[PDB]
């Protein structure tokens, strides 16, 4: 086992590949504390299930097998080249490779990519996955009801022949290749589409297919005999089989992982506290551990619709009075609490910049003079009473640190815990819940659904992205027409450097509003057993790229 033999070294899989190999064979033994959310490629949102989807299904574009920056740029997979952009970023054309096959030996055609995209529109039958494609492809004057309610194709998606697909968007969208790399755009042939039941027998265009799924118990993958290695620039497809054990307690999982009973943790939520201690303090175990950024941001939102948070000076007071050390310590410091940040973008993104509008003093513990001055400006010099919304666990400990921080300047906060299961949907994520319970501050964590500035920031701050019926991620309900207009400009800007500059302007404007208080970029500790080959943290996921892995002989 790993505790008795040294590994590649601390962080060896962060920005590089550990134990490179082309050796095929063996069974990759994976573990997760949770079952998949779905085996329908359109109905998944879990990051680790998206990783699993790289074994099961190909897409037009896919993130390349690359530990460096280029891993963030979608590469041709089923398509012969990247999307060809015409009409100002409004029309995207792809050409499909010829002769490709599903696991049942039937052909992949452009009709199947159109069908997959159409399926997304059937939210009454196929909820659970990303819906970015809907506003880009739906005609508001002639709405598309999905492929079960009409057999007329979506008018914005053309298939001039079996190997060509054309997407006619409602507006420019610079990041369209990224949407083609999401699993909901993996082809689904209509002939095999059993709708609500698709996850029970999905077709596979990837190097593996589902052999057995027992809910809460196991998922076994075997090779897809019709996948063609010569046609796949992404996937080495090394193991003969992949076996996922499901449902273990998270500490039980760490223990058995470190003991060698499983090879890798697919779920990828990192070592829990006990194993984090064990692993980071033992010389041999550190050699088997990577500590990447996950690209998640932990932050507090302030909601102008909840008095007195409508006043920019109240919001700035909170920013100045935040004890950044105490808050990081609540989330795992002094040594394991993520990476301190004063701005929003993760350093994976081109726009990432120095921005600290509200510095918290030479010790980062709060500038209380600045905070009090802001409170005087708000006409509340002695403070005020407010409520912070959170959920039990780590979010609660962070809320407590906020309470303690702000008490120093007379802002008296009461904590309101919301239902854990629905926190992101019906709790923090519902504008009516937030108003009903007076949640002027909210504690949350956010990861982009694709590794770009738009994917990361638009859902958090774009006025058009306020979700009035739940699942809202623009928590302050910021609707600044200048912010919105800048975002629009990025979407039709072809030059990546001009785009970065525009996004720097958006971020600065968002911080001027002071509605988001960034706390840390999250970090995690992944453990890798030394006999696993090709282990690397995928910069697009913050998790190991499962599909690239093999087994040493």
């Amino acid at each position: 086992p790993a505790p008795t033999t040294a590994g590649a070294g601390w962080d060896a899989g962060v920005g590089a590949l550990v134990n490179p190999s082309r050796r095929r064979g063996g069974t990759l033994r994976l573990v997760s504390s949770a079952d998949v959310d779905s085996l329908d490629p359109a109905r998944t949102y879990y990051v680790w299930v998206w990783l699993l989807q790289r074994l099961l299904n190909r897409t037009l574009m896919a993130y390349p097998t690359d530990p460096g920056p280029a891993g963030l740029v979608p590469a041709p997979d089923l398509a012969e080249g990247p999307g060809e952009v015409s009409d100002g970023g409004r029309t995207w054309t792809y050409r499909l490779r010829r002769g490709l096959r599903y696991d049942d030996g039937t052909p992949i055609t452009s009709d199947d990519v159109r069908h997959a995209v159409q399926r997304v529109f059937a939210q009454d039958v196929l909820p659970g996955g990303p819906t970015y494609l809907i506003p880009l492809l739906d005609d508001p004057e002639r709405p598309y009801p999905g492929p079960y309610r009409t057999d007329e194709p979506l008018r914005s998606v053309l298939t001039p022949d079996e190997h060509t697909i054309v997407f006619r968007l409602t507006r420019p969208f610079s990041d369209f290749d990224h949407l083609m790399a999401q699993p909901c755009a993996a082809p689904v042939p209509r002939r095999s589409d059993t709708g609500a039941d698709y996850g029970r027998d999905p077709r596979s265009s990837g190097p593996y297919r589902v052999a057995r799924h027992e809910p809460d118990t196991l998922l076994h993958l075997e090779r897809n005999p019709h996948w063609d290695r010569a046609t796949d620039p992404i996937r080495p497809a090394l193991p003969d089989r992949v076996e996922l054990t499901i449902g273990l307690d998270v500490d039980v999982l760490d223990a058995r992982l470190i003991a060698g009973e499983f090879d890798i943790n697919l779920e990828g939520r990192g070592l829990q506290h006990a194993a984090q201690r064990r692993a980071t303090a033992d010389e041999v175990l550190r050699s088997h551990t990577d500590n990447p950024r996950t690209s998640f941001l932990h932050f507090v939102a302030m909601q102008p619709h909840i008095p007195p948070f409508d006043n920019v000076h109240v919001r700035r007071a909170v920013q100045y009075a935040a004890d950044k050390i105490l808050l990081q310590d609540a989330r795992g410091g002094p040594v394991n609490g993520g990476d301190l940040t004063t701005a929003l973008f993760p350093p994976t993104l081109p726009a990432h910049q120095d921005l600290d509008l509200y510095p918290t003093g030479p010790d980062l513990r709060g500038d209380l003079d600045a905070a009090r001055a802001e409170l005087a400006a708000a006409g509340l010099p002695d403070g005020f009473r407010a409520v912070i919304g959170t959920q039990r666990g780590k979010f609660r400990l962070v809320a407590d640190a906020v309470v303690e921080s702000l008490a120093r300047v007379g802002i008296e906060l009461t904590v309101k815990e919301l239902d854990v299961a629905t926190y992101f949907s019906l709790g923090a994520g519902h504008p009516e819940t937030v108003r009903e319970h007076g949640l002027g501050l909210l504690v949350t964590d956010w990861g982009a659904d694709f590794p770009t500035e738009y994917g990361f920031l638009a859902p958090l701050v774009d006025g058009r992205q306020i979700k009035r019926n739940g699942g809202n991620w623009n928590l302050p309900e910021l609707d600044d027409p200048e912010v919105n207009a800048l975002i629009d400009e990025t979407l039709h800007t072809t030059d990546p450097a001009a785009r970065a500059e525009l996004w720097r302007a958006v971020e600065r404007r968002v911080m001027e509003h002071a509605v988001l208080l960034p706390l840390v970029h999250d970090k995690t500790l992944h453990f890798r057993n030394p006999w696993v080959t090709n282990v690397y943290v995928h910069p697009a996921f913050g998790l190991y790229d499962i599909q690239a892995m093999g087994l040493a002989e």
Partner: peptide, 6 residues
């Protein structure tokens, strides 16, 4: 997306 999660 939101993060993972006695």
């Amino acid at each position: 997306r939101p993060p993972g999660f006695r």
